[PDB]
């Protein structure tokens, strides 16, 4: 700011940047899809695991 | 994007390979196997099962029942010679 000698715009953009300092708001969308995915995955995983464990001993 | 679910779906690897077919054969076959056989048949003492025991064993290729059995027919008709003469 002390470089500029036309300074009446550095206060403008300083305050505008610090005003709009949140430039994007948070996203957590992986809490609805991740649990659903995890349920099907877990089910299938466990099914495979138990099935093959049984077969090994058979 | 989220990883797909192929690795965890196994139920077509249960027919997917050929030894599954062999497995379902020998889980029955070998499980229903006895330690040793039921019995081989060699004797039973009907008094001609004894004939089998001495002569018609699994390992007896010895010509002795043949000789004996031949000699039996010789004894039969030789007497019948004297039945007709």
Swiss-Prot record, chain A:
It is found in: Mitochondrion; Mitochondrion inner membrane. It comes from the Eukaryota. Belongs to the ATPase d subunit family. Present with 6820 molecules/cell in log phase SD medium. F-type ATPases have 2 components, CF(1) - the catalytic core - and CF(0) - the membrane proton channel. In yeast, the dimeric form of ATP synthase consists of 17 polypeptides: alpha, beta, gamma, delta, epsilon, 4 (B), 5 (OSCP), 6 (A), 8, 9 (C), d, E (Tim11), f, g, h, i/j and k. Mitochondrial membrane ATP synthase (F(1)F(0) ATP synthase or Complex V) produces ATP from ADP in the presence of a proton gradient across the membrane which is generated by electron transport complexes of the respiratory chain. F-type ATPases consist of two structural domains, F(1) - containing the extramembraneous catalytic core, and F(0) - containing the membrane proton channel, linked together by a central stalk and a peripheral stalk. During catalysis, ATP synthesis in the catalytic domain of F(1) is coupled via a rotary mechanism of the central stalk subunits to proton translocation. This is ATP synthase subunit d, mitochondrial. The lineage of its organism: Eukaryota, Fungi, Dikarya, Ascomycota, Saccharomycotina.
UniProtKB/Swiss-Prot annotation, chain B:
GO terms for cellular component: mitochondrial inner membrane; mitochondrion; proton-transporting ATP synthase complex. Its main location: mitochondrion. It comes from the Eukaryota. One of its GO terms (biological process) is proton transmembrane transport. It is found in: Mitochondrion; Mitochondrion inner membrane. Keywords: ATP synthesis, CF(0), Hydrogen ion transport, Ion transport, Membrane, Mitochondrion, Mitochondrion inner membrane, Transit peptide, Transport. The keyword Membrane applies. Present with 14600 molecules/cell in log phase SD medium. Belongs to the ATPase F chain family. F-type ATPases have 2 components, CF(1) - the catalytic core - and CF(0) - the membrane proton channel. In yeast, the dimeric form of ATP synthase consists of 17 polypeptides: alpha, beta, gamma, delta, epsilon, 4 (B), 5 (OSCP), 6 (A), 8, 9 (C), d, E (Tim11), f, g, h, i/j and k. Mitochondrial membrane ATP synthase (F(1)F(0) ATP synthase or Complex V) produces ATP from ADP in the presence of a proton gradient across the membrane which is generated by electron transport complexes of the respiratory chain. F-type ATPases consist of two structural domains, F(1) - containing the extramembraneous catalytic core and F(0) - containing the membrane proton channel, linked together by a central stalk and a peripheral stalk. During catalysis, ATP synthesis in the catalytic domain of F(1) is coupled via a rotary mechanism of the central stalk subunits to proton translocation. This is ATP synthase subunit f, mitochondrial. It comes from Saccharomyces cerevisiae (strain ATCC 204508 / S288c) (Baker's yeast). The chain holds residues 7 to 91 of 101 of the full protein.
């Amino acid at each position: 700011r002390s470089v500029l000698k036309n300074t009446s715009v550095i206060d403008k953009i300083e305050s505008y940047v610090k005003q709009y300092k949140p430039v994007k708001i948070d996203a957590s969308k992986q809490l609805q899809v991740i649990e659903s995915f995890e349920k099907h995955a877990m089910t299938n995983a466990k099914e495979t695991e138990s099935l093959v464990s049984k077969e090994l001993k058979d | 994007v989220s990883t797909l679910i192929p690795p965890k779906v196994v139920s077509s690897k249960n027919i997917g390979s050929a030894p599954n077919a062999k497995r379902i054969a020998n889980v029955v076959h070998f499980y229903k196997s006895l330690p040793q056989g039921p019995a081989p048949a060699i004797k039973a003492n009907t008094r001609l099962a004894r004939y089998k025991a001495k002569y018609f064993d699994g390992d007896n290729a010895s010509g002795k029942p043949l000789w004996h059995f031949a000699l039996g027919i010789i004894a039969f008709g030789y007497s019948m010679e004297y039945y007709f003469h």
